[PDB]
Amino acid sequence: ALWQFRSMIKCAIPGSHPLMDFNNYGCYCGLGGSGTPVDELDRCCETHDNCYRDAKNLDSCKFLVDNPYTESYSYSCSNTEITCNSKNNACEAFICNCDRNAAICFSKAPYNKEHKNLDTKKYC
Amino acid sequence: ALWQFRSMIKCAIPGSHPLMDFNNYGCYCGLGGSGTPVDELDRCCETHDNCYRDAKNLDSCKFLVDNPYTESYSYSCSNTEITCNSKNNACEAFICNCDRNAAICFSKAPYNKEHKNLDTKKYC
Numbered sequence: 001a002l003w004q005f006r007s008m009i010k011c012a013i014p015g016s017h018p019l020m021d022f023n024n025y026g027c028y029c030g031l032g033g034s035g036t037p038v039d040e041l042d043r044c045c046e047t048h049d050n051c052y053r054d055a056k057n058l059d060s061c062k063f064l065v066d067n068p069y070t071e072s073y074s075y076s077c078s079n080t081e082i083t084c085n086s087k088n089n090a091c092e093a094f095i096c097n098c099d100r101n102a103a104i105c106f107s108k109a110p111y112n113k114e115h116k117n118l119d120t121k122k123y124c
Numbered sequence: 125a126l127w128q129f130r131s132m133i134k135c136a137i138p139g140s141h142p143l144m145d146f147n148n149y150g151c152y153c154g155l156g157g158s159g160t161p162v163d164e165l166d167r168c169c170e171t172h173d174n175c176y177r178d179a180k181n182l183d184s185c186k187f188l189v190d191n192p193y194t195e196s197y198s199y200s201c202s203n204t205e206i207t208c209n210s211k212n213n214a215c216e217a218f219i220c221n222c223d224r225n226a227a228i229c230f231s232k233a234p235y236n237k238e239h240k241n242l243d244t245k246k247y248c
């Protein structure tokens with residue numbers, strides 16, 4: 001679920017303000033995303049977006065009947081480390097995995113302040 | 125901006141995990157929204173959605189081509205009381221007031237556990 005994805009961003013990036021930081025960044029961090037991603041951080045978001053589309057297509061997720069952000073999973077934070085709990089059923093695990101990789105992705109890419117809050121209609 | 129709405133809610137509602145309880149609630153607390161709101165709280169979300177639609181059609185917001193969640197404004201919190209700064213220019217003032225109106229509304233509307241994470245495809 002969305003709140004769990006934010007939780008993971010805070011786990012991976014302890015002092016982060018995930019909504020402040022990564023909503024409205026680039027062409028892809030935010031609802032939707034078109035165009036060429038502007039950088040590594042943006043490409044993380046595009047990957048997340050792709051992953052969710054792939055979850056919606058997943059046979060295991062066939063009873064998912066809204067947005068993967070509405071699907072809860074079980075996860076744990078351990079000293080900066082995220083673990084998708086092994087108990088998760090298949091759809092929950094796949095979506096927890098989407099989020100966890102994006103979280104780790106966020107923590108490794110450079111943050112470029114100028115890429116934040118783009119006029120996506122002119123540049124994406 | 126959406127991160128500000130998140131802190132507005134934490135202001136009016138001390139307990140609060142905004143993404144956790146208010147997101148994916150009823151037919152209108154979450155993305156889009158169609159259908160008949162399922163309770164007063166759900167109407168708080170419907171009303172905010174409409175405020176945002178208003179915000180995009182408001183002449184003072186004409187240079188805001190994105191979505192109002194990406195518009196930053198200036199606000200304050202004291203004693204669970206929300207302040208939209210006098211120094212907001214008109215769009216920002218409007219959007220801040222949509223967000224303040226909603227957070228207050230959330231704070232007085234009953235939260236009905238059984239309306240959380242509704243099958244919107246089925247029920248909205």
Ligand SMILES: CCCCCCCCCCCCCCCCOC[C@H](COCC(F)(F)F)OP(=O)(O)OC
Binds near residue numbers: 006022031127142155
């Ligand atoms: C202000 C707090 C909102 C939660 C309480 C209010 C209740 C109503 C909320 C209505 C729905 C608004 C939330 C919709 C946000 C959509 O989510 C889009 C998502 C936001 O990113 C969140 C993250 F922190 F993970 F970066 O962009 P995405 O590309 O998927 O990920 C980067």
Ligand SMILES: [Ca+2]
Binds near residue numbers: 032
């Ligand atoms: Ca996106």
Ligand SMILES: [Ca+2]
Binds near residue numbers: 152155
């Ligand atoms: Ca909505």
